[PDB]
Structure 1
Amino acid sequence: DIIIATKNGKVRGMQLTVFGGTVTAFLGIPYAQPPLGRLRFKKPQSLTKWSDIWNATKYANSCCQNIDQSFPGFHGSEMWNPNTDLSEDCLYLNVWIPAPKPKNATVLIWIYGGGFQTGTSSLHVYDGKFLARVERVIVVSMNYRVGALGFLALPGNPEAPGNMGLFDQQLALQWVQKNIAAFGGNPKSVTLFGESAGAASVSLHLLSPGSHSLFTRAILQSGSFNAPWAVTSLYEARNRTLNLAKLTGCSRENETEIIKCLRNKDPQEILLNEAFVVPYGTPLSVNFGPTVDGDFLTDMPDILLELGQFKKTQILVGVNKDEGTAFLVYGAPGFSKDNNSIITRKEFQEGLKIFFPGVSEFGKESILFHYTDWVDDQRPENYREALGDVVGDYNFICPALEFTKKFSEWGNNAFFYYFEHRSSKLPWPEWMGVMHGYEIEFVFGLPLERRDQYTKAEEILSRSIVKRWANFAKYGNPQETQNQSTSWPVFKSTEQKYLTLNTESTRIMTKLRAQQCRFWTSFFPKV
């Protein structure tokens, strides 16, 4: 029976057998006041204190959110849907510790993605027990509010200031500063990691001055805040908040009154109207996301990055070979998970209109021109592959490389990876390749479980990535030093070396997507 005294009271954990050893898991520890009633849309308030033993022995409620119903019964989509009850009462976190209790263990804090609209820390692919067993690190993950409930903004107004879910993440970081030594963690050795919006979130903590002292370093998987979906303009945030009001019958003249009305709405009515606050979305829409609130974020983040205003520390950044494919089967015409999706030029053109709705005709033609010069055989898959690369390059890969360059120019070591292994268990079809989100299970060490039907080469790839991540967190250097592995060189401006992660042979390469990213980075923003 394992009980830990925290600043707010006692917590009971549970023991787990993992690989012939034990991990102690504390699932569902609260770290804030439930944000209900008058607290809805406000910054998380600090926890009152309890007396008695809080039983942290099951995952807590996931935050309210819309759910992906495009492929019911299909594991490829459903694995990402929440696996605990939805409730506004969702501000909880999990702690996995090695057994016996470590003395001063490095801490890995996971921030999930989901577009800032969805996600929960209790998914199977985020289970931190394998990392605690194998690397003897402590792993922490928190639920944070998503959608309008997490990111509604009327900026400057403390009834709905914006970025509440980023403040939920920050308050969990603070909980780890105050409490983790009780669990055997070193509050001075904390690495944030996250994927997609969780990676964009990690990048914004590098920018936020109230996060500077809450962590040591950062890992960004397929996301960074300069991605075109990651930050909402003040203009679009106000418009969306008042669009939400209009839809829920909460248009008022005093803005504090709009929010008060919005506080009387059933959470379902808020969720049901979120999709419509925008005149046309895309599969990549982030209707309620981070804004420049003057609090968490003091200025436009592109300006902070460019002018070197961020935490000086090491970063590890990477992307997957086919980031954009997952999004094509949520509305691009001629695409389907259930066939090979050989599409025509006309379909490609229609697909750009689906992904680039506010963009001028010239803008869309410039994309077509950059991506359709083949290269050369015709090649029925030409247009199918180009559309996935358009979406992946624009939304994930070029912003990650641009973030990595600008960050490294200010003197800190940066390491960049390109993940190019397709999981042998992937339920999505082959044409979708190495999809967005499908390195995560390798990072959390799921293929280390021999009972799970991953191949032996995958068990080895995962073990090595697990070691590199842990070495990054502990030592700021993502090497695998014992097995004659390829040395991972720092990513510098000028050379731009990156490491490929694959089952066959790790390679050092240079200037990932050089020609494509010149297009998105220097020309497209003008269009």
Structure 2
Amino acid sequence: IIIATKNGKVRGMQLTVFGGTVTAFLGIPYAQPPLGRLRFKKPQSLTKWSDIWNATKYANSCCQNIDQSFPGFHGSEMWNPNTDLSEDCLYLNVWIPAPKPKNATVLIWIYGGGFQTGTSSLHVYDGKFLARVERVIVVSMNYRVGALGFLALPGNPEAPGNMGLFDQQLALQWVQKNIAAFGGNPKSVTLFGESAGAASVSLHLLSPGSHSLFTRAILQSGSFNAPWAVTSLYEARNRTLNLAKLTGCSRENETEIIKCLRNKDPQEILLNEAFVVPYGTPLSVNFGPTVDGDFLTDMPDILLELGQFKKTQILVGVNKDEGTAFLVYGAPGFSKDNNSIITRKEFQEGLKIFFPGVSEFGKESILFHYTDWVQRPENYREALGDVVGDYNFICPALEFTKKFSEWGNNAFFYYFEHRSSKLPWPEWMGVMHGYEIEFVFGLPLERRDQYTKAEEILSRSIVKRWANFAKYGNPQETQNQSTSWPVFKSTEQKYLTLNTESTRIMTKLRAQQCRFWTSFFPKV
């Protein structure tokens, strides 16, 4: 199977999925390799090839540091890259139903990883189930991460910032130009992403250059108003110069810092990213999106508040225990290998880990708000996870959703509360960050994979709802006497819970907690 694209022919491969066939085109190039003088620059458009590009395997993942905290452990290792790392990493994947569809809706996946890590070739991002079961086309891209994707000296085209967001955008352009050849509808394109991938989706909603590149958006556990999502111009400058210092690249001329950094081995840039900040946290984003005057024209909070964004439907949600994953990456008393019963003093020390530049009063205020107990040994352990999840994911997603919906558009909010039967992490971590993704991609639809029957049913329902959102703007499951998913409006704030037992309509998720983070805490 060979498809002709604007830049040349690509050969795919046939896959058997559930007694049917999917065609996969893995590793199509969508930009010039950003090597040499192109390092730190916006991606440059790719010129024609002749002969057939073989898109029959996943391409290189972008250069990135790896999580070495738990070698041999599937819970962490499943997120590490599974393809060689290389600066030559600007590739995308396409999965299409067979037979070729006529005008299929397109789902474009944007991975998370804190803007520092990630790749589209992870097993939990495999678009073949969606293509098979819902007859949508799935596209995913690799984009640059870390300093190589996000180093900024604002205004300077040698290192303007947001390069990895421009990579995403150019892959969106590729779909616009090329997807009809694969049987796709460029006028029916939904972005979906998790964590930094969801924050990215929310920035494409804000970016005038992305407005005509997609139709609708799905935000899983992330949005640009999250505290980790956008680097200030002040932080970015200091981090860029710190990185120059650490590599011997400190210079009088800023265009000469960049020239120097372009001579460094990728591996030397990677080694020094960790230290560009005095204190870090398990949620640090050393190199992330900045207000660059190009992708992002103003501080995104101002854009959101004043309604300057693409007017379309959004689907947004979070997991019940967003904060737990992070606690084993440095909070005292915590271990994935015991029940992590901590004391008051450990709790207090954990706040120092998660809120390093925060006044003592700021920290006491967190403790005040989260330790009014309803005695119980896991009180403090539970409070720290909620602190981290509410601050970093849940309250920001809910505020994004309120503010976005106030401008007239339909929004749907979910609260995912199912723990995978196969989860390798301990029970105390509950419904973790990242662990809805396999349900969205339909992994539990595979009977060989040993998920429960209740999990097959949940995943089939989520898959259908996501697909209906993409095709029709409305994440209903219309056939199986399912709970209707109400629109989220800033007054009632109705959301849908996703679980194997009973799906419920609820209101005002974490009302009391989010008043704290959203209205008090930003003042300290």
- TM-score normalised by the chain length of structure 1: 0.99
Distance in 1 (CA, whole Å) between partners of 2:498 and 2:308 is 31
Match of 2:463 among 444, 449, 466: 466
Q: How far apart are residue 410 of structure 1 and its match? A: 0.1
Distance in 2 (CA, whole Å) between partners of 1:514 and 1:365 is 20
Aligned to 1:407: 404
Deviations, residues 172-221 of structure 1 (Å, cap 9, x unaligned): 00000000000000000000000000000000000000000000000000
Q: How far apart are residue 335 of structure 1 and its match? A: 0.1
Match of 1:419 among 406, 416, 421: 416
Deviations, residues 424-466 of structure 1 (Å, cap 9, x unaligned): 0000000000000000000000000000000000000000000
Distance in 2 (CA, whole Å) between partners of 1:314 and 1:297 is 21
Aligned to 1:241: 240
Deviations, residues 342-371 of structure 1 (Å, cap 9, x unaligned): 000000000000000000000000000000
Distance in 2 (CA, whole Å) between partners of 1:16 and 1:353 is 50
Aligned to 2:425: 428
Matched length = 524
1:74-113 paired onto structure 2 within 5 Å: 74-113=73-112
Aligned to 1:142: 141
Distance in 1 (CA, whole Å) between partners of 2:232 and 2:251 is 23
Distance in 2 (CA, whole Å) between partners of 1:313 and 1:508 is 23
Aligned to 1:219: 218
1:388-407 paired onto structure 2 within 5 Å: 388-407=385-404
Distance in 2 (CA, whole Å) between partners of 1:457 and 1:175 is 38
Q: How far apart are residue 94 of structure 1 and its match? A: 0.2
Give 3-state SS (helix, strand or coil) of 2:209's partner: helix
Distance in 2 (CA, whole Å) between partners of 1:173 and 1:70 is 34
Deviations, residues 358-399 of structure 1 (Å, cap 9, x unaligned): 000000000000000010xx1000000000000000000000
Distance in 1 (CA, whole Å) between partners of 2:301 and 2:67 is 31
Distance in 2 (CA, whole Å) between partners of 1:292 and 1:46 is 23
Distance in 2 (CA, whole Å) between partners of 1:3 and 1:506 is 44
Q: How far apart are residue 266 of structure 1 and its match? A: 0.2
Distance in 1 (CA, whole Å) between partners of 2:37 and 2:372 is 57
Give 3-state SS (helix, strand or coil) of 2:96's partner: strand
Deviations, residues 144-194 of structure 1 (Å, cap 9, x unaligned): 000000000000000000000000000000000000000000000000000
Deviations, residues 467-486 of structure 1 (Å, cap 9, x unaligned): 00000000000000000000
Distance in 1 (CA, whole Å) between partners of 2:217 and 2:492 is 22
Distance in 1 (CA, whole Å) between partners of 2:73 and 2:228 is 26
Distance in 1 (CA, whole Å) between partners of 2:354 and 2:25 is 42
Distance in 2 (CA, whole Å) between partners of 1:435 and 1:248 is 37
Give 3-state SS (helix, strand or coil) of 1:11's partner: strand
Deviations, residues 132-151 of structure 1 (Å, cap 9, x unaligned): 00000000000000000000
Q: How far apart are residue 117 of structure 1 and its match? A: 0.2
Distance in 2 (CA, whole Å) between partners of 1:290 and 1:479 is 33
Distance in 2 (CA, whole Å) between partners of 1:168 and 1:295 is 14
Give 3-state SS (helix, strand or coil) of 1:317's partner: strand
Deviations, residues 216-251 of structure 1 (Å, cap 9, x unaligned): 000000000000000000000000000000000000
Distance in 2 (CA, whole Å) between partners of 1:218 and 1:12 is 30
- TM-score normalised by the chain length of structure 2: 1.00
Give 3-state SS (helix, strand or coil) of 2:33's partner: coil
1:86-485 paired onto structure 2 within 5 Å: 86-375=85-374, 378-485=375-482
Give 3-state SS (helix, strand or coil) of 2:414's partner: strand
Distance in 2 (CA, whole Å) between partners of 1:118 and 1:218 is 22
Distance in 2 (CA, whole Å) between partners of 1:156 and 1:400 is 30
Q: How far apart are residue 519 of structure 1 and its match? A: 0.1
Q: How far apart are residue 495 of structure 1 and its match? A: 0.1
Distance in 2 (CA, whole Å) between partners of 1:478 and 1:167 is 29
Distance in 2 (CA, whole Å) between partners of 1:401 and 1:341 is 29
Distance in 2 (CA, whole Å) between partners of 1:30 and 1:411 is 38
Distance in 2 (CA, whole Å) between partners of 1:496 and 1:206 is 21
Distance in 2 (CA, whole Å) between partners of 1:452 and 1:279 is 44
Give 3-state SS (helix, strand or coil) of 1:219's partner: strand
Q: How far apart are residue 48 of structure 1 and its match? A: 1.1
Aligned-CA RMSD value: 0.2
Distance in 2 (CA, whole Å) between partners of 1:142 and 1:85 is 15
Give 3-state SS (helix, strand or coil) of 1:276's partner: coil
Distance in 1 (CA, whole Å) between partners of 2:254 and 2:361 is 39
Distance in 2 (CA, whole Å) between partners of 1:417 and 1:332 is 29
Q: How far apart are residue 315 of structure 1 and its match? A: 0.1
Is 1:487–2:480 an aligned residue pair? no
Distance in 1 (CA, whole Å) between partners of 2:268 and 2:186 is 41
Distance in 1 (CA, whole Å) between partners of 2:207 and 2:292 is 11
Distance in 2 (CA, whole Å) between partners of 1:305 and 1:479 is 27
Distance in 2 (CA, whole Å) between partners of 1:432 and 1:498 is 23
Q: How far apart are residue 503 of structure 1 and its match? A: 0.3
Match of 1:514 among 511, 516, 521: 511
Distance in 2 (CA, whole Å) between partners of 1:315 and 1:494 is 17
Distance in 2 (CA, whole Å) between partners of 1:522 and 1:448 is 42
Give 3-state SS (helix, strand or coil) of 1:187's partner: strand
Distance in 2 (CA, whole Å) between partners of 1:321 and 1:12 is 42
Deviations, residues 471-507 of structure 1 (Å, cap 9, x unaligned): 0000000000000000000000110000000000100
Q: How far apart are residue 411 of structure 1 and its match? A: 0.1
Distance in 2 (CA, whole Å) between partners of 1:490 and 1:248 is 51
> Any runs of at least 4 consecutive aligned residues in structure 1 with deviations exceeding 3 A, and if so which?
none
Distance in 2 (CA, whole Å) between partners of 1:407 and 1:334 is 39
Give 5+ residue unaligned stretches, structure 2: none
Q: How far apart are residue 301 of structure 1 and its match? A: 0.1
Give 3-state SS (helix, strand or coil) of 1:10's partner: strand
Q: How far apart are residue 42 of structure 1 and its match? A: 0.1
Distance in 2 (CA, whole Å) between partners of 1:465 and 1:402 is 23
Distance in 2 (CA, whole Å) between partners of 1:140 and 1:523 is 40
Give 3-state SS (helix, strand or coil) of 1:139's partner: strand
Q: How far apart are residue 26 of structure 1 and its match? A: 0.1
Distance in 1 (CA, whole Å) between partners of 2:253 and 2:504 is 60
Give 3-state SS (helix, strand or coil) of 1:410's partner: coil
Distance in 1 (CA, whole Å) between partners of 2:400 and 2:516 is 16
Distance in 1 (CA, whole Å) between partners of 2:268 and 2:9 is 37
Q: How far apart are residue 58 of structure 1 and its match? A: 0.1
Distance in 2 (CA, whole Å) between partners of 1:49 and 1:240 is 38
Give 3-state SS (helix, strand or coil) of 2:496's partner: strand
